[PDB]
Amino acid sequence: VTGFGAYQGRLVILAGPEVCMSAAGNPLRWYRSTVTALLTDDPINIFSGAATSTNFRHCVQFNKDLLLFARSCQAVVPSSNAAITPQTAQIVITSGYTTDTLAQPGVVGRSVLYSMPRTEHFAGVLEIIPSNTTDSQYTSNDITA
Amino acid sequence: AFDGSIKSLLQGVSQQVPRERLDGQVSVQLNRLSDVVNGNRRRPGARYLADVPTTSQYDDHVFASYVDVQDTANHVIINTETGQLLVISEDFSTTLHNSTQQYLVASAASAIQTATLRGDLYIANTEKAPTKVFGSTTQQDASVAVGTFVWYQYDSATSVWKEAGAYGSPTGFSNMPIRISLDGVYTVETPAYEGRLAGSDETNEDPGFIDNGVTGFGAYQGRLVILAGPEVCMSAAGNPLRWYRSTVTALLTDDPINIFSGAATSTNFRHCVQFNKDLLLFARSCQAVVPSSNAAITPQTAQIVITSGYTTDTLAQPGVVGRSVLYSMPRTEHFAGVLEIIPSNTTDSQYTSNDITAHIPRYLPGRIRSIVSSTTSNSSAFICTGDSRSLFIQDYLWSGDEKVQSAWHQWTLPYPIVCTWFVRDRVYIGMRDGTTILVVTIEPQAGNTIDSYVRPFSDVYLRVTITDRQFALPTRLRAAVGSGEGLFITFADTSMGGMWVGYESIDPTTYVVTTVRNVPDGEYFVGLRYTSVLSPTPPLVRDANGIVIGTYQSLLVRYELTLKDSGEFHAIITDSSRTLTDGNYSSLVYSSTELLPNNPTDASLGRTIIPVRAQAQDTVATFEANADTDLCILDIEYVLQYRARRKRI
Amino acid sequence: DASLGRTIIPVRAQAQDTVATFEANADTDLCILDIEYVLQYRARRKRI
Numbered sequence: 001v002t003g004f005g006a007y008q009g010r011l012v013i014l015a016g017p018e019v020c021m022s023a024a025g026n027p028l029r030w031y032r033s034t035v036t037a038l039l040t041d042d043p044i045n046i047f048s049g050a051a052t053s054t055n056f057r058h059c060v061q062f063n064k065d066l067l068l069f070a071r072s073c074q075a076v077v078p079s080s081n082a083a084i085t086p087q088t089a090q091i092v093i094t095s096g097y098t099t100d101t102l103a104q105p106g107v108v109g110r111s112v113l114y115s116m117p118r119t120e121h122f123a124g125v126l127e128i129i130p131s132n133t134t135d136s137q138y139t140s141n142d143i144t145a
Numbered sequence: 146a147f148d149g150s151i152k153s154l155l156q157g158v159s160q161q162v163p164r165e166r167l168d169g170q171v172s173v174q175l176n177r178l179s180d181v182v183n184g185n186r187r188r189p190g191a192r193y194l195a196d197v198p199t200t201s202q203y204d205d206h207v208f209a210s211y212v213d214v215q216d217t218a219n220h221v222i223i224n225t226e227t228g229q230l231l232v233i234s235e236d237f238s239t240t241l242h243n244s245t246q247q248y249l250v251a252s253a254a255s256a257i258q259t260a261t262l263r264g265d266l267y268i269a270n271t272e273k274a275p276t277k278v279f280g281s282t283t284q285q286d287a288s289v290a291v292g293t294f295v296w297y298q299y300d301s302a303t304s305v306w307k308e309a310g311a312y313g314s315p316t317g318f319s320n321m322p323i324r325i326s327l328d329g330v331y332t333v334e335t336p337a338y339e340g341r342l343a344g345s346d347e348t349n350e351d352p353g354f355i356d357n358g359v360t361g362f363g364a365y366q367g368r369l370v371i372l373a374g375p376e377v378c379m380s381a382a383g384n385p386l387r388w389y390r391s392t393v394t395a396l397l398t399d400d401p402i403n404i405f406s407g408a409a410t411s412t413n414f415r416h417c418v419q420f421n422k423d424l425l426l427f428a429r430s431c432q433a434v435v436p437s438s439n440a441a442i443t444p445q446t447a448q449i450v451i452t453s454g455y456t457t458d459t460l461a462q463p464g465v466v467g468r469s470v471l472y473s474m475p476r477t478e479h480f481a482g483v484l485e486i487i488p489s490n491t492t493d494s495q496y497t498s499n500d501i502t503a504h505i506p507r508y509l510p511g512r513i514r515s516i517v518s519s520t521t522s523n524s525s526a527f528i529c530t531g532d533s534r535s536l537f538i539q540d541y542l543w544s545g546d547e548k549v550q551s552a553w554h555q556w557t558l559p560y561p562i563v564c565t566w567f568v569r570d571r572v573y574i575g576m577r578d579g580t581t582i583l584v585v586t587i588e589p590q591a592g593n594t595i596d597s598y599v600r601p602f603s604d605v606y607l608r609v610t611i612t613d614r615q616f617a618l619p620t621r622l623r624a625a626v627g628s629g630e631g632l633f634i635t636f637a638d639t640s641m642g643g644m645w646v647g648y649e650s651i652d653p654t655t656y657v658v659t660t661v662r663n664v665p666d667g668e669y670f671v672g673l674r675y676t677s678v679l680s681p682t683p684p685l686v687r688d689a690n691g692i693v694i695g696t697y698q699s700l701l702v703r704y705e706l707t708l709k710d711s712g713e714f715h716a717i718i719t720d721s722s723r724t725l726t727d728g729n730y731s732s733l734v735y736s737s738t739e740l741l742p743n744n745p746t747d748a749s750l751g752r753t754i755i756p757v758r759a760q761a762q763d764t765v766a767t768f769e770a771n772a773d774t775d776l777c778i779l780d781i782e783y784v785l786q787y788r789a790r791r792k793r794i
Numbered sequence: 795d796a797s798l799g800r801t802i803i804p805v806r807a808q809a810q811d812t813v814a815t816f817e818a819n820a821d822t823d824l825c826i827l828d829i830e831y832v833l834q835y836r837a838r839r840k841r842i
Contacts, residue, residue, distance in 0.1 A: 002603040017261075017263070046367070047263070047367030048367060049261055049262045049263075049364035049365070049368075049369075050260075050261065050419075051260060051261075052210065052211065052212055052213070052261065053213045053261050053266075053327070054261075056656060067704070070211070076422075077645065079336040080439045085506070087398070087440070088439070088440045088441060089441065090366060090441045091367075092419075093420070093422065094422055095467060096372075096420075096466070096518075097467045097520050098520050098570070116521065116572045117298070117521060117569070118570070119521075119570055119588065119590050120591070122572065131490055134490075134491050134492055134493075135493075137490055139466075139490060139546075141545075145542070147839060147840055147842040148839050149841065149842070686842070749811075750810070
């Protein structure tokens with residue numbers, strides 16, 4: 001377990017390149033309850049991959065989505081017009097900034113801050129803001145150059 | 146007479162006529178930096194780290210990358226001639242794996258590709274083709290019966306009726322990509338891929354990559370991706386070993402998928418990148434994307450769509466710089482270019498491409514062979530096949546939704562360059578000294594001190610101790626000094642740190658060096674020299690509306706230079722047919738408290754003046770410096786003599 | 795403390811080759827509303 005959080009009434013446990021979610025409103029259920037069919041409310045797990053490697057470390061909800069942070073890439077879990085189900089969950093990469101993973105990101109109402117390394121002995125900061133004229137879309141800026 | 150000032154010096158080189166150059170562009174830059182905040186100063190020196198335990202005779206038979214295990218990051222090095230695989234620690238202190246692999250033999254280091262899906266790193270060689278293999282089986286023309294579509298086999302061991310594909314079906318593959326573990330022990334093993342278990346040739350066809358071979362590799366949505374020219378193949382969801390459809394009684398969402406493509410002439414996809422939530426495909430004369438949706442990709446919704454028609458090249462893998470992606474294009478038979486693609490922000494997947502090298506159509510020799518990204522310092526690096534001893538840089542900056550800086554310039558190094566890669570806020574460079582490989586790094590955004598020592602202005606420098614005005618020349622510099630390279634020595638400690646010292650002789654048999662008189666025993670650096678040429682652009686006269694006038698009726702009198710810190714440098718001014726000015730200049734005077742014995746010879750602020758006396762635009766100016774002192778230019782001013790004799794209208 | 799006032803400081807040196815600092819470590823505040831200077835610069839040729 002390399003992370004922890006909640007989303008859509010489901011506990012979330014990060015396991016590196018995988019994301020695990022419990023049953024809807026039941027934090028004690030992690031295995032699928034019945035095999036006679038496929039139930040919407042049963043737990044769900046979803047996989048991810050990249051060119052070198054990925055290891056998600058933190059999660060934040062913010063603009064109706066769920067954000068995932070790693071060293072060399074960033075991903076999001078898209079929302080939809082229907083509650084997440086085992087047949088629609090997915091992870092998609094969105095950017096390629098290099099960052100650090102010692103400090104949990106913070107939220108200041110209209111933006112989210114996460115740190116990056118400048119050199120061996122100095123640090124930086126980045127900021128991410130959402131678009132206002134469409135669905136989930138993000139852009140990041142450097143505010144300590 | 147009138148005066149003036151050049152606006153800035155932060156837009157790199159250009160090759161247009163002076164009438165059209167944008168503000169800030171210069172004519173020549175070499176071994177300089179386009180740094181903001183600090184100005185246009187010289188680059189730092191390259192530091193020596195270690196030598197990789199391998200050998201090579203050619204400049205392009207080496208591949209390098211990195212992989213992460215737990216909290217550690219490790220380097221991956223592959224030699225493509227003898228087929229060797231190496232894994233090293235982040236500090237080059239220990240070797241974690243070393244073995245030979247006959248599968249990794251290829252002509253050049255551009256055929257290797259990698260991907261990671263669950264817990265292993267896969268390596269693919271695009272120069273080799275897989276083939277089907279048939280194993281011994283008990284099936285008979287183990288009776289087989291057909292229901293109804295579905296085929297069944299009878300297992301006489303337990304009397305069950307298990308499914309089976311058909312008679313004569315394959316049971317595996319050969320020449321497939323190898324796999325490496327990442328659990329912490331680095332095991333290498335060829336995985337066992339599955340043959341057909343259900344379905345016949347008319348309902349479970351070949352994956353498609355059997356015939357066209359493998360021309361690419363990548364991962365997407367937890368599925369391995371194998372490009373087979375005009376086709377794209379994907380494995381099962383979370384199962385890299387499954388390529389055929391598992392069952393025929395129905396159609397399962399999680400089973401593999403293949404999708405076809407076509408065009409007016411031909412298509413052959415070669416590379417893939419994820420970027421803005423989609424998957425991008427690159428080819429010579431067209432580009433395509435695999436659209437995302439509100440539901441996970443399924444066999445009943447996958448498609449490929451063309452989006453643009455730019456002509457590009459396919460030797461170098463595209464790079465990502467956070468907000469954009471770079472891929473190369475050919476300019477002409479002997480020069481290259483670059484293109485950039487950025488996503489839209491007010492809708493779903495939409496892309497637009499721009500050309501960002503139209504103003505330098507003859508600055509990049511040959512074909513681009515590599516692309517590197519350093520988002521931690523806002524720069525990028527390119528390697529060209531036309532010259533193996535130079536590295537081309539770019540510097541960019543962003544503000545809101547606007548791009549402000551596109552500086553270009555060139556560097557040079559004493560040895561041929563082999564490969565480059567980026568790991569955790571540094572860029573590494575490998576060079577071929579004889580048949581051995583070295584490793585050096587350049588960090589422009591670092592201070593002036595490294596662990597109580599002052600960094601020198603030299604390349605591939607090492608630390609050494611001097612006793613009785615003698616020491617032994619390190620091995621890795623004997624070849625360079627023997628071919629004209631200039632040996633350079635500097636102080637390493639105390640107040641006099643960074644100052645030049647000289648030598649008197651080198652013994653041909655033992656390579657012992659004797660220094661100049663009166664140097665005390667202590668620590669010292671040793672390295673090589675380089676030059677830092679620069680050349681401004683001639684001034685111009687511009688009226689109220691911005692039009693240019695007096696190109697043949699103006700005369701230049703003088704230059705004024707303001708320097709934040711510098712020593713003596715060298716300036717040459719020449720005309721169409723003769724030299725005008727020449728000689729050394731400096732900003733440190735005999736009455737400045739900065740000039741003391743046992744202290745560096747630099748001035749914190751000063752000025753210099755240079756006479757020209759010639760036609761403004763028929764001139765060339767250069768400033769050189771190849772010593773231990775910096776050269777930082779803050780501003781430039783001139784005196785212009787122009788006299789209009791009629792009103793304007 | 796004074797509700798409003800002013801202070802004057804002489805420098806007499808090159809403009810950019812200077813460093814200025816203001817310290818206060820006592821029970822009184824230090825609120826700076828504005829800063830003004832006197833500059834001596836004299837051009838001797840027109841500009842163009």
